[PDB]
Amino acid sequence: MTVHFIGAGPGAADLITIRGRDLIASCPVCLYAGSLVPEALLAHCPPGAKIVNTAPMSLDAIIDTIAEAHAAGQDVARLHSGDLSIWSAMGEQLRRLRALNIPYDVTPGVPSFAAAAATLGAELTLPGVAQSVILTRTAMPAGETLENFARTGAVLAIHLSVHVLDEVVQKLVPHYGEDCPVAIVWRASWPDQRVVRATLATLQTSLGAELERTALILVGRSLAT
Amino acid sequence: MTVHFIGAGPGAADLITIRGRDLIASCPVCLYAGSLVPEALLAHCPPGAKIVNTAPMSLDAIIDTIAEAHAAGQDVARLHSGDLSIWSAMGEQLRRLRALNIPYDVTPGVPSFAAAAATLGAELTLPGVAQSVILTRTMPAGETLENFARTGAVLAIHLSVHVLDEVVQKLVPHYGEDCPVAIVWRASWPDQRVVRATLATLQTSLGAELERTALILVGRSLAT
């Protein structure tokens, strides 16, 4: 047996990869990270599959469940939302699996910044304007500061609490300017999707009625309309 | 009709999204950007499709071709490798299309950095180590090697094998000579090649150079 870590993508069931879909279809055990993974993907699980919601489970119980599948020789479709390379929390699971010598592989998914850019119809890189993209969130490691990032002029993709938005704006404005385009996306790709396009000066006044805490913000001239 | 911009992913045909494959299957015209789009995806094109490699074509030639499909009322699958949000040249094309009131949408794909990290079995963001990832290539004013390196973020750098020396020398001061690094050629392709090492030992470890370009991933979070 093998544990197959799978990037489920941003939310829409048709934005999983073909490989990921095939793997869900052929595993008798499926461990999935709660309602961030659309239940429509669970329809691909073969009959016979036991389906396990890891979201309210502890790290220890997740590993015990994988261990009992491993003892039974049963493959696992381990679904995380988005892509596995960023903010999946796959690493701590991998470290626990290497300590038990349970085999695993990784199938990449669509990251939410890509899904966000697609909904906006935007190429983030624009010759002359920006050729780089920085992915980050708001204890951050030593040199990982908004100012350090803002100095580059790169397109920024920041995962954040709406509660700290005011600080984010203050730190970016000296670098990018009052009038710099920014776009906020909530629940990218879900039926529920909301998209606000604004400027740094006008972002806070352009959040209307939307009460959700976490969002993704994209900042740069290449986000102009 | 619509022009459907589709992220083909890193190379393997099964790394396209469900939606992308379905869109290729439904478009009587397919404009694909070079042989970085796998043959196996082209086999999803419908019977009698007009299939055209856009890679040697100028922007005007690509737009003319699109206009021709628009006049016939024929959907276009515009396939680019990776994801369209980065280094796709979609932006210029979208501008020309808005000019002509030709409708389009965008389907995201899997970018190469994700594919490369996957074959390494790496989460790049690990608590207390790295919470940022910089996607760059070897340029606008502030986008220098030094300005990115001074942050300590994980770096995903699409580069020419020939400047690899120079890139390494500019990263050592910020990342340390023993900092983990990996080179990936042709991520997800049947012939993909990977070398994992350290900044100081990468060059002795290299071996066969499958292509003149490659993607390097730099940071402690690679192996830790």
Curated annotation (Swiss-Prot), chain B:
One of its GO terms (molecular function) is precorrin-4 C11-methyltransferase activity. InterPro entries: 4pyrrol_Mease (IPR000878), 4pyrrol_Methylase_sf (IPR035996), 4pyrrole_Mease_sub1 (IPR014777), 4pyrrole_Mease_sub2 (IPR014776), Cbl_synth_CobM/CibF (IPR006362), Siro_Cobalamin_biosynth (IPR050161), Uropor_MeTrfase_CS (IPR003043). One of its GO terms (biological process) is methylation. Its EC number is 2.1.1.133. It catalyses: precorrin-4 + S-adenosyl-L-methionine = precorrin-5 + S-adenosyl-L-homocysteine. Pathway: Cofactor biosynthesis; adenosylcobalamin biosynthesis; cob(II)yrinate a,c-diamide from precorrin-2 (aerobic route): step 4/10. Keywords: Cobalamin biosynthesis, Methyltransferase, S-adenosyl-L-methionine, Transferase. NCBIfam families: cobM_cbiF (TIGR01465). Belongs to the precorrin methyltransferase family. This is Precorrin-4 C(11)-methyltransferase. It comes from Rhodobacter capsulatus (strain ATCC BAA-309 / NBRC 16581 / SB1003). The lineage of its organism: Bacteria, Pseudomonadati, Pseudomonadota, Alphaproteobacteria, Rhodobacterales.
